[PDB]
Amino acid sequence: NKRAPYWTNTEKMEKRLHAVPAANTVKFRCPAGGNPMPTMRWLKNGKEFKQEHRIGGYKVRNQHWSLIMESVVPSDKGNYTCVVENEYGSINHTYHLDVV
């Protein structure tokens, strides 16, 4: 039953550009399936996004396939991409964050 990653709910993913006021919380999701369970990682502007990249750091909820950034600030604007992978494939989606 092995199978490459696939998005399980594209509805959540249709809204690509997000404009949010500073200090609000943004949450990005890339619901996925696959056998074996794929892993997920996030890039910000094409480069690995790490905890130390912003003051507030960030939360990853694997069960919900989401990236959460609390109290956004202007320097958080950018492109956020979820890369999901397993031995049979690697797929990605990109969101754009604009901080109003």
Next chain:
Amino acid sequence: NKRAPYWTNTEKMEKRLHAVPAANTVKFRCPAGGNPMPTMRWLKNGKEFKQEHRIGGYKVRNQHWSLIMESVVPSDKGNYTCVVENEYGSINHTYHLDVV
């Protein structure tokens, strides 16, 4: 509307192991979708499978996402994998061919 490759009809793909008498024709398919249109390539035992690898050569029908090998011979046994890709992702599936 950009989107990574995805299989559009997994039904065709459920039968992974194929045992076929010599001299018969085998056809493998990996129906796929994605935006932009993904490309497809085939590997035989993990390595690029080229026309010169077998006497009969092989047919690729892009419209139907299939690899066709006429008059199979014992040396054709092996693992056949369709790799489908576009800028948003790369996915693969593997079939096993046994020549009876």
